[PDB]
Ligand SMILES: Cc1c(C(=O)c2c(C3CC3)[nH]n(C)c2=O)ccc2c1c(=O)n(CC1CC1)c(=O)n2C
Ligand SMILES: Cc1c(C(=O)c2c(C3CC3)[nH]n(C)c2=O)ccc2c1c(=O)n(CC1CC1)c(=O)n2C
């Protein structure tokens with residue numbers, strides 16, 4: 221069931237912010253690898269003496285890449301006189317974040333009706349404040365609370381172009397790449413203990429819980445179930461070591477594990493991304509064995525044709541089925557040096573009337589199907 | 600003249616090492632932007648719990664990209680029991696380097712006959728030791744001395760595959776990109792005071808000095824003038840602010856300013872790089888005005904045809920002339936967030952009998968030619 225218990229009005233995912241040591245190189249690699257266009261910047265060329273921030277967009281998906289400049293450039297500034305376009309930015313926090321975790325997500329940003337209200341109600345309901353509400357050029361308000369580890373939930377509200385102080389990039393520099401990615405479907409955290417993490421986040425948002433190998437997890441969802449925030453914990457004591465525990469070890473604790481990006485055509489997206497894997501883009505996890513694709517006919521043969529299921533086989537796409545929809549999904553290798561953050565590409569089919577959130581689930585059934593296919597490929 | 604005063608036997612440039620916060624993303628961006636292949640790795644997959652290091656190669660050019668892992672992965676190790684493939688690596692030095700300077704060159708590595716001898720003679724002649732000689736698997740010896748700022752000169756000698764502990768990357772991951780770059784021609788440092796820097800470096804190497812707008816510079820060279828190490832200082836008090844001083848400000852002091860990469864066909868290299876500028880590669884400095892290319896006929900018309908000089912005009916190539924050879928050159932925009940390090944692409948024509956080093960100079964004459972062309976394009 222869906223009690224619609226959101227303690228404030230939540231709209232959609234707004235952006236994901238990566239904290240890096242060099243925003244330029246990460247943003248260029250991601251743009252080519254994922255087919256995202258350069259759309260806005262805030263940096264020295266725009267008067268920002270504090271941080272370099274570059275925004276990539278594909279459909280409604282917004283990826284922001286930020287790194288600190290030398291603190292010496294802004295030594296004369298005080299918070300009232302700052303040239304930073306994102307007032308929550310702090311040199312010491314950013315350098316500490318990146319040296320501790322490496323490349324990763326700092327902020328999961330959701331658009332709300334009123335960011336100051338969302339912040340107040342959140343903290344009144346247990347949220348740990350991270351950055352108080354600040355109004356930007358009488359137009360946009362942003363506030364931040366702690367989510368898990370060093371990741372924050374960022375509230376953004378607009379009265380009536382990304383953020384004040386960001387400039388649109390010249391289209392000579394803005395090449396219209398597009399591989400079909402259209403929006404952020406869900407953002408997943410890894411924590412040591414799932415119980416306290418769930419109680420905390422569900423406590424200050426009012427998100428409700430949305431309807432065996434390595435992990436336990438649960439999905440918090442907004443009223444219309446379009447902001448989806450799953451959380452995982454490790455399952456210790458197994459033959460194979462939990463990838464959640466490996467994450468916590470290499471990340472130095474809790475953090476964002478994967479971003480799932482919805483594509484309007486996952487076959488085109490994966491053809492385009494795989495073309496670029498070895499020339500600067502992203503690698504994908506190893507494909508499942510043919511026994512997997514042999515056994516799909518008897519499970520999804522009603523939704524996908526024999527050509528398409530074979531087209532899944534070339535690209536290594538996995539498929540899972542809910543009682544309401546079907547899910548196409550595939551996972552990249554880790555995005556940076558450490559075995560921590562990765563990306564999932566997904567497409568959902570079903571649950572129409574617009575599409576309802578979570579249609580098809582998150583692919584939990586693909587674990588035992590993978591195990592069964594591996595047990596059957598040695599035969 | 601060339602006194603051939605090298606205090607030890609120096610061969611050629613061996614590699615350039617970048618210290619980064621995420622080696623993966625920088626190495627992938629550089630590989631696509633410059634047309635360099637992935638050739639070796641030392642990381643978690645090879646047993647290195649200390650640093651991730653990825654090597655790119657194009658012809659004889661070797662770019663190494665290194666970043667630290669969490670120190671927790673190697674907390675039980677001592678220097679005798681280290682899994683680091685580069686024993687000079689230090690987590691604290693690397694994090695301090697990158698937070699201070701951002702993305703930049705840590706090591707300029709030259710191949711010598713005997714790295715222990717080169718280190719001893721260097722320090723006996725004033726070099727500041729950085730890392731003592733260490734023998735790797737009874738096969739390779741590496742030692743490091745301070746060069747300028749936080750940049751070190753790294754000596755490498757081989758008894759008889761990059762370094763012990765590096766693995767060749769699977770050719771499924773190794774795409775054979777090549778845009779024509781073949782070797783490192785020179786590596787240039789920026790310092791506050793040129794005099795003391797020259798006296799220091801020439802003092803411990805025996806390199807000799809190799810034969811007005813913003814800078815003073817001088818070029819130290821090895822016996823055969825194939826290791827070329829120019830150094831710049833700012834010229835203060837001008838109408839336009841020195842780019843050397845801007846470098847020192849944004850870099851937090853002295854460091855490596857530019858790498859010049861020789862191409863066997865600069866026209867093909869710049870066509871290939873410019874195709875990729877807006878899809879993840881490198882941007883170039885603004886092209887000179889047509890008045891420049893109008894005035895080349897009367898200076899290089901004897902070496903380049905009218906088609907090629909027009910082909911220079913499309914690509915924005917600059918041309919300068921020595922009394923012994925001619926030089927084709929162009930500069931990228933800065934490689935990362937800060938206005939610090941950039942790359943020069945060059946091709947030299949002349950001085951044959953093999954090609955002698957520095958053929959054509961370094962393009963000093965292109966300053967006044969550029970000024971004159973700008974004064975003549977408003978007419
Ligand atoms: C991350 C993930 C998901 C997934 O996206 C989500 C889950 C799954 C319950 C985990 N719950 N929620 C909310 C999700 O968004 C689904 C299937 C997967 C994996 C995955 O990582 N590996 C490789 C790692 C195990 C070695 C797999 O083999 N399979 C089959
Ligand atoms: C770096 C550089 C070089 C060059 O490579 C080297 C030099 C030159 C004396 C500087 N000496 N040595 C040893 C060299 O390797 C040559 C010409 C240049 C520039 C350059 O940066 N800019 C733009 C900056 C000035 C605003 C220019 O307009 N011109 C024309």
Ligand SMILES: [Co+2]
Pocket residue numbers: 406408478480564582
């Ligand atoms: Co998922």
Ligand SMILES: [Co+2]
Pocket residue numbers: 785787857859943961
């Ligand atoms: Co040069």
